[PDB]
Design an enzyme around this catalytic site. Structure first.
Site, PDB file in Angstrom:
ATOM      1  N   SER A 532      17.257 -19.165  54.776  1.00  0.00           N
ATOM      2  CA  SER A 532      16.606 -19.857  55.855  1.00  0.00           C
ATOM      3  C   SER A 532      17.109 -19.303  57.217  1.00  0.00           C
ATOM      4  O   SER A 532      17.263 -18.313  57.429  1.00  0.00           O
ATOM      5  CB  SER A 532      16.430 -21.385  55.438  1.00  0.00           C
ATOM      6  OG  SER A 532      15.483 -21.704  56.383  1.00  0.00           O
ATOM      7  N   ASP A 617       5.427 -24.037  51.056  1.00  0.00           N
ATOM      8  CA  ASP A 617       5.914 -23.903  52.444  1.00  0.00           C
ATOM      9  C   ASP A 617       7.074 -22.746  52.554  1.00  0.00           C
ATOM     10  O   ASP A 617       6.889 -21.994  53.155  1.00  0.00           O
ATOM     11  CB  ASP A 617       6.150 -25.563  52.532  1.00  0.00           C
ATOM     12  CG  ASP A 617       6.650 -25.812  54.022  1.00  0.00           C
ATOM     13  OD1 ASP A 617       6.198 -24.894  55.044  1.00  0.00           O
ATOM     14  OD2 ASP A 617       7.556 -26.286  54.272  1.00  0.00           O
ATOM     15  N   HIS A 652       8.566 -27.370  39.805  1.00  0.00           N
ATOM     16  CA  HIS A 652       8.703 -28.687  38.784  1.00  0.00           C
ATOM     17  C   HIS A 652       9.648 -29.260  39.706  1.00  0.00           C
ATOM     18  O   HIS A 652      10.667 -28.755  40.302  1.00  0.00           O
ATOM     19  CB  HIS A 652       8.923 -27.829  37.454  1.00  0.00           C
ATOM     20  CG  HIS A 652       8.816 -28.802  36.515  1.00  0.00           C
ATOM     21  ND1 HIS A 652       9.429 -29.724  35.998  1.00  0.00           N
ATOM     22  CD2 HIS A 652       7.570 -28.856  35.664  1.00  0.00           C
ATOM     23  CE1 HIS A 652       8.912 -30.327  34.967  1.00  0.00           C
ATOM     24  NE2 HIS A 652       7.540 -29.598  34.439  1.00  0.00           N
TER      25      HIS A 652
END
Length: 677
Positions: A532, A617, A652
């Protein structure tokens, strides 16, 4: 051997401040996720990754098995008491999800199920428990659940007396809620229908039609997150409004009907504060007088009446606090260490919690009841699995409550060090490293250098079980505590963001060079990873210092920085001007463009690299890493491995979500280990 995918070039000019940038891969962005050419490129790259990494299957199996084999799949949480009931969370190897149980505090034999995630997940595609809290009277359970994987939580209410559920659902919430002291009224946060940002506080009567719910507060500035808290005293529910730089707190009387928000201190740019209420006083952690924060005591909201308990200090960052009967406990950072200190309310006695490890983290754990001398705190280090301790604040008796269980693990097999690196501007950068003693030979070991370096988030040194798979194959694992993180407090963060962001990348390069120069590893076998904003780090460092690293893992990387930060239609952008800056201003356009990895890809040799993205996302939208790989394929002059792996699942909760996380770590680690071989 194999021909990689080649994305079509569609030159798309973007002109800002008179500067025209031509983006050949602008089209890989499809907000609607309809364009079949975009999906063909993502799928083509996945197929290439699968094909290129097929020989590593056996290694991936070995790594996955050894990582799962370290873990005990029978896990029981440490029980806590709250309002006269004891609570435990239970994991069984036959169950996908946790079971939450409780019993009256004076009971030991029998436990009652509060909620069974496996039962809740029945006939659903997805399940995540976002929060759970019983009412003050012990009669009602509130749960925040996500059945759709969009992090929009439904709140539901269970009558514990007859295990029946009420008929209503509070929909599209943040999962943040608090009980009024009547056990009948809850406040909750509703997310915006379009933007999904938390922005409204509602009051709901349990059992009733949510159409009757009263709007208590609406936040006008969507850079301000809306959360709810409850004070230690239970006298107030807090509406906690915060941006990156600025706070504002409103008080709701938790005891009386028809409460309306009471302003604490009106927001003002760059004043961050948080409050609690206890012993008929407000306690305020505030940066009003110093960037490293102070702690204040007040009878009233007025900032002029706040009394200094702990003044802000240049060399100590105040991170947080907890209130107890006889003691104040604070969490601080100093000289690159986390620390806990306790101060007696009456005597002023100060005590410091002692440790003996060069590379550890300590923090305040869950302490729901203030009328106690027992503090629960966490500890972890690069050599010592995560531990929960209980300290007697009066007697200093320290008792272990729980240890992370790590099978096939002998802690004395590993050594760790704290290293300080003098960066190119003379600033001292801390480093934490761990390796296996019996395979260490100076100058010979592969390095894996990990960094993040944004938002003031610290890569605090702590235990990783998965990390043992690298250490038992001769790696020296390094956390580089680079500027833009929080390890040296607020000024360390500020000296690595906005017009100081380049210090993040320079620090990572300076640390890497020093560790090679000092004999910690093999100059030819240096690897790096980040995700990120740590992927922004990977992207900038391989453009600036491509020869330093043999191979890189860049997870969900933020790389198209200038284009993304010019476009408010992209989710995160409006809230990130105080991190990277606003490139609508030529000064920030120039400063950001200089490091924006997508823009600074050049015709030069790059390291081997594995890049990840996902549809569902991520902080970073799936297209940025895809564009970056397409541009790297077009320009790079080397014949090293470049792979893009796009996660196409929706993801999940429960056991198989952890299964997935281990499969991803085994794919990344096999990629790196094959390069080191």
């Amino acid at each position: 051997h194999m021909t990689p995918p080649k994305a079509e070039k569609r030159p798309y000019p973007i002109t800002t401040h008179g500067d025209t940038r031509v983006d050949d891969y602008y089209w890989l962005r499809d907000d609607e996720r309809t364009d079949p050419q975009v999906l063909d490129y993502l799928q083509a790259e996945n197929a290439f990754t699968d094909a290129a990494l097929k020989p590593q299957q056996a290694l991936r199996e070995t790594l996955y098995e050894e990582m799962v084999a370290r873990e005990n799949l029978y896990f029981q949480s440490v029980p806590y008491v709250r309002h006269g009931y004891r609570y435990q969370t239970r994991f069984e190897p036959g169950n996908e999800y946790a079971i939450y149980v409780r019993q009256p505090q004076a009971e030991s034999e029998h436990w009652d199920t509060l909620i069974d995630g496996n039962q809740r997940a029945e006939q659903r595609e997805f399940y995540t428990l976002g929060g759970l809290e019983v009412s003050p009277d012990n009669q009602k359970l509130a749960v925040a659940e996500d059945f759709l994987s969009r992090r929009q939580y439904d709140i539901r209410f269970k009558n514990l007396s007859d295990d029946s559920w009420t008929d209503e659902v509070l929909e599209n919430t943040s999962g943040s809620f608090e009980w009024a002291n009547d056990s009948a009224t809850v406040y909750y946060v509703r997310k915006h229908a379009k933007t999904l940002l938390p922005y409204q506080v509602y009051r709901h009567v349990v059992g009733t039609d949510p159409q009757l719910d009263e709007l208590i507060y609406e936040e006008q500035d969507d850079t301000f997150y809306v959360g709810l808290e409850k004070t230690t005293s239970d006298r107030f529910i807090l509406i906690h409004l915060s941006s990156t730089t600025t706070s504002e707190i409103l008080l709701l009387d938790a005891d009386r009907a028809d409460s309306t928000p009471q302003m604490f201190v009106p927001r003002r740019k760059d004043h961050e504060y948080g409050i609690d209420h206890y012993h008929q006083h407000f306690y305020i952690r505030s940066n009003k007088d110093g960037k490293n924060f102070g702690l204040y005591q007040s009878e009233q909201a007025d900032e002029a009446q706040w009394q200094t308990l702990i003044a802000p200090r240049i060399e100590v960052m105040l991170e947080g606090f907890s209130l107890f009967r006889d003691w104040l406990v604070v969490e601080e950072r100093s000289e690159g260490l986390t620390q806990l200190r306790q101060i007696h309310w009456q005597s002023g006695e100060v005590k410091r919690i002692a440790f003996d490890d060069p590379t550890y983290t300590t923090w305040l754990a869950y302490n729901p009841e203030p009328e106690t001398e027992l503090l629960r705190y966490g500890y972890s280090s690069m050599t010592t699995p995560t531990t929960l301790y209980e300290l007697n604040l009066d007697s200093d008796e320290r008792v272990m409550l729980k240890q992370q269980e790590v099978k096939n693990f002998t802690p004395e097999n590993y050594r760790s060090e704290r290293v300080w690196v003098k960066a190119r501007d003379g600033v001292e950068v801390p480093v934490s490293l761990v390796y296996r003693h019996d395979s260490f030979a100076r100058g010979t070991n592969p390095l894996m250098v990990y960094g993040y370096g944004s938002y003031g988030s610290s890569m605090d040194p702590a235990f990783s079980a998965s990390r043992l798979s690298l250490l038992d194959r001769g790696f020296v694992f390094v956390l580089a505590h680079i500027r833009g993180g929080g390890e040296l407090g607020q000024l360390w963060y500020e000296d690595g963001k906005l017009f100081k962001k380049q210090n993040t990348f320079n620090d990572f390069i300076d640390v890497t060079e020093a560790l090679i120069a000092q004999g910690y590893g093999d100059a030819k076998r240096v690897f790096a990873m980040g995700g990120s904003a740590g992927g922004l780090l990977m992207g900038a460092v391989i453009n600036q210092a491509p020869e330093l690293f043999n191979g890189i893992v860049a997870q969900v990387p933020f790389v198209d920085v200038v284009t993304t930060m010019l476009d408010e239609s992209i989710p995160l952008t409006t809230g990130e001007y105080d991190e990277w800056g606003n490139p609508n201003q030529q000064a920030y356009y120039d400063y950001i463009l200089q490091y924006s990895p997508y823009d600074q890809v050049k015709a030069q040799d790059y390291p081997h690299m594995l890049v990840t993205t996902g549809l569902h996302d991520s902080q970073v939208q799936y297209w940025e890493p895809a564009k970056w790989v397409a541009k790297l394929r077009e320009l790079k002059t080397d014949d090293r491995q470049l792979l893009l792996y796009t996660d196409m699942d929706s993801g999940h909760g429960g056991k198989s979500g952890r299964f997935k996380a281990y499969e991803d770590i085994a794919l990344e680690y096999a990629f790196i280990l094959a390069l080191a071989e």
